[PDB]
Design a protein around this ligand. Sequence first.
Ligand SMILES: NCCCNc1nc(-c2ccccc2O)nc2ccccc12
Ligand SMILES: [Ca+2]
Ligand SMILES: [Cl-]
Ligand SMILES: [Cl-]
Length: 266
Amino acid sequence: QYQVGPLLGSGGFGSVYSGIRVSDNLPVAIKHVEKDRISDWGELTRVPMEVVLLKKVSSGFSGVIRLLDWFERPDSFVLILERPEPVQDLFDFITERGALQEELARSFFWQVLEAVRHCHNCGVLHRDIKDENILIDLNRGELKLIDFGSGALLKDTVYTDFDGTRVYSPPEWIRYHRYHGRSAAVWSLGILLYDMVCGDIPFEHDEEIIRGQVFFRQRVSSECQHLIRWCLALRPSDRPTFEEIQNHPWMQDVLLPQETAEIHLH
Ligand SMILES: NCCCNc1nc(-c2ccccc2O)nc2ccccc12
Ligand SMILES: [Ca+2]
Ligand SMILES: [Cl-]
Ligand SMILES: [Cl-]
């Protein structure tokens, strides 16, 4: 069914290969994870939570990489995922080009917010929003979220477990091992937005997270700084809702994805 190409990446999520579907030559990504390396399991019949979450968000179109198929092997699960070409993750894009111009960051950040709101509307909490989990479709200027392997069903009660990226995790997690879904998502989005406009993350150590004082090392507009510090409020209830982020003055007059690729990516 699939012709396997080069390894695209490996890590906590397993090993992802480029691939082609033999029937129609569709580009795909093929991701393998060992059963013993999976901790979180759910039901559709017993599968990794990742599969449950991906099925919940893979309906229709969105800024989420769609699950096409999956296989169970004796000791592993294989996922067949959509693959845009050419593509680059946002971590590589930022490493390569440095801090993003605000117009470009606005466009990218907006698409991330739309993608995250889609997950939430589908009852899915990502829990690992970061540059490495965002793919850029370089020709269409469209961003796509990947790696639901630390995710959970969205709920309104407290989470007491976390296995995403610590430097994107909120202070209430660091201090108390307790967070709520959406306000922890908004914290990670503040980290992400800082990362886009400054070219690196604002905090490296637990004590920096807990203090929550943001220093801007690059020239960033007042409205962008304001949105960032809002998302990064120490008290979860002081953070903006998704609607408040998208109504923020910094977020107005966003470029279309194709405009974005034409101005910034070609
Ligand atoms: N940090 C990026 C990892 C390597 N690249 C890629 N990684 C993943 C991927 C990585 C971890 C978990 C789920 C996933 O779908 N999916 C991709 C889908 C299409 C193209 C590339 C992909
Ligand atoms: Ca500045
Ligand atoms: Cl693995
Ligand atoms: Cl942690």
